[PDB]
Write a protein that binds this DNA or RNA. Sequence first.
DNA 1: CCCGGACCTGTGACAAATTGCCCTCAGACGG
DNA 2: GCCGTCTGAGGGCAATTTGTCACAGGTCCGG
Length: 213
Amino acid sequence: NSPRIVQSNDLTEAAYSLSRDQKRMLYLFVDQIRKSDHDGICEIHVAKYAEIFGLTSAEASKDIRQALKSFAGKEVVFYYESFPWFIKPAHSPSRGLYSVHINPYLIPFFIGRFTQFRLSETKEITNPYAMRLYESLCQYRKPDGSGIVSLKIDWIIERYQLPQSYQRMPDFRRRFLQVCVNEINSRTPMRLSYIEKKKGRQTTHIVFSFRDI
DNA sequence: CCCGGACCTGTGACAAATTGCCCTCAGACGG
DNA sequence: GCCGTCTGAGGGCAATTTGTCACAGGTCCGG
Ligand SMILES: [Mg+2]
Ligand SMILES: [Mg+2]
Ligand SMILES: [Mg+2]
Ligand SMILES: [Mg+2]
Ligand SMILES: [Mg+2]
Ligand SMILES: [Mg+2]
Ligand SMILES: [Mg+2]
Ligand SMILES: [Mg+2]
């Protein structure tokens, strides 16, 4: 059925800041690259993007165009080593068609210890931080569909590049943790719960348990 | 001892960002 | 060779969500 995304854990655990629209495009690049027999040159069709994510052609065009120009200057850190995503601006040879030049030094980090999920699992998620959380949980999923993992809060803040006010724990709870656990439970086939680990007055880890519906 | 102080929690406000919608009009193609 | 239609590249919108901070209200420490 739907496209099966796979990626090296090094990408799941990398430090970067991307929007929802950019992350959506990134899944197709990883799919194109992996399906190959490099050049790092990928392509996106407006009308295909619209059908995949149930958008109109117009709003697809707006999403691709603005996503594409917001990649400029974005950088990726693997814990460390920093790379730019793109080494040339995007451009459109034909109407409804975009051509992009991914940094060929990124290829081995995409294909290597791996993470996998079908694209239908994530295509209704809205908050990009919630996409990051669902990817990290998939990294620990078992064949049958369950798993349990303890993630450190400081590592969450670094890897997902959360904004500065979420270093105050009550804001972390209200605007990130609760919201992203609610989307996953509402928008994916996963059912997720958690509990907090403490040391003194400080909360240090979050312990996630999940099963499949 | 009661205090001021250094931690922690959650909630009420407001500011800045993102969402799916809507409308226009020229490009690429076929009847 | 023109034209009606299917696209998609632009300009926008109000309704929600996300990002930030002041203040109320708990504990323990040391003086
Ligand atoms: Mg958009
Ligand atoms: Mg402490
Ligand atoms: Mg006593
Ligand atoms: Mg008093
Ligand atoms: Mg706008
Ligand atoms: Mg009261
Ligand atoms: Mg007080
Ligand atoms: Mg309290």
